[PDB]
Design an enzyme around this catalytic site. Structure first.
Site, short mmCIF file in Angstrom:
data_model
loop_
_atom_site.label_atom_id
_atom_site.label_comp_id
_atom_site.label_asym_id
_atom_site.label_seq_id
_atom_site.Cartn_x
_atom_site.Cartn_y
_atom_site.Cartn_z
N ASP A 39 0.86 -1.20 0.00
CA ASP A 39 0.00 0.00 0.00
C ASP A 39 0.89 1.25 0.00
OD1 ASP A 39 -2.20 1.95 0.88
OD2 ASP A 39 -3.32 0.04 0.92
N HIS A 69 -3.56 6.17 3.65
CA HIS A 69 -4.34 4.99 3.26
C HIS A 69 -3.74 3.69 3.81
CE1 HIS A 69 -5.77 2.01 0.14
NE2 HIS A 69 -6.87 2.77 0.14
#
Ligand code: CA
Length: 279
Positions: A39, A69
């Site tokens: 990520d 995120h």
């Protein structure tokens, strides 16, 4: 164990009905398993990770999560207050830049990196990878996810947020991994969630509170939020010995709450992740 006044998604995965507020779970809590979060990175110093998170690889100038995120997703996997598997070990792989974007070649490299790196780590109860990312169909990206799964890692991927059939997105459309749709706290399919025959399971995805950068917290929505609930549940069930990386997605589907979701198109599974905890 019971966590009172839990975020609704944790309560939902330990209940057969919506509307409860306690998360019930076995004390082992994923200890001895490992989850790679692929990520934007992880703010490993956040107090909610209790020293159990570490960055292991970046494809950019820094290993810092400048976006948030990846830290939110990692918190739903394994933070103390917001996590499914509260004692798992988290490894961050930064394949997305701080705007949340990344090229397919970099995402593929990060998947092949995890397949090798897990052989250097002590994860006696097993290894999970959580991919809250995707884009348009690419047979190469699908093939990289299939390789990671074949190498012995439980791969969970987001179905995508286009309210469309996930067959046209990757790695969502790779059949051999675990493709995760999103639901909301009233047991509706989330209005943005992709659907279709490739989906394996739904998890909570609307208005999910978790960790954020700067030592903070925030609530956001996406199939990106549903995927770490399923990745954390897999780590939790592997530590209990109920399943293995090769069969965890099928075990989660077999033991799910069935038929409780509304607004599910014909041909998509009506299955909601459930931990079957019995005190
Ligand atoms: Ca599948």
């Amino acid at each position: 164990a019971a966590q009172t006044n839990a975020p609704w998604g944790l309560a939902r995965i330990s209940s057969t009905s919506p509307g409860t507020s306690t998360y019930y779970y076995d004390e082992s809590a994923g200890q001895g398993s490992c989850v790679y979060v692929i990520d934007t990175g992880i703010e490993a110093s956040h107090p909610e990770f209790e020293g159990r998170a570490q960055m292991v690889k970046t494809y950019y100038y820094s290993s810092r999560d400048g976006n948030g995120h990846g830290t939110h997703c990692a918190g739903t996997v394994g933070s103390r207050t917001y996590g499914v598997a509260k004692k798992t070990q988290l490894f961050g792989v930064k394949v997305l830049d701080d705007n949340g974007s990344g090229q397919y070649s970099t995402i593929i490299a990060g998947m092949d990196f995890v397949a090798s790196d897990k052989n250097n780590r002590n994860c006696p109860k097993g290894v999970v990878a959580s991919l809250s990312l995707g884009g348009g169909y690419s047979s190469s990206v699908n093939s990289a996810a299939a390789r990671l799964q074949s190498s012995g890692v439980m791969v969970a991927v987001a179905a995508g947020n286009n309210n469309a059939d996930a067959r046209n997105y990757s790695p969502a459309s790779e059949p051999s991994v675990c493709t995760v749709g999103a639901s909301d706290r009233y047991d509706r399919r989330s209005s943005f969630s992709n659907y279709g025959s490739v989906l394996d399971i739904f998890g909570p995805g609307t208005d999910i509170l978790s960790t954020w950068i700067g030592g903070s917290t925030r609530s956001i929505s996406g199939t990106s939020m549903a995927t770490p609930h399923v990745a954390g549940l897999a780590a939790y069930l592997m530590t209990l010995g109920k399943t293995t990386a090769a069969s965890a997605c099928r075990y989660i589907a077999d033991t799910a709450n069935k038929g409780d979701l509304s607004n599910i198109p014909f041909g998509t599974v009506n299955l909601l992740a459930y931990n079957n905890y019995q005190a």
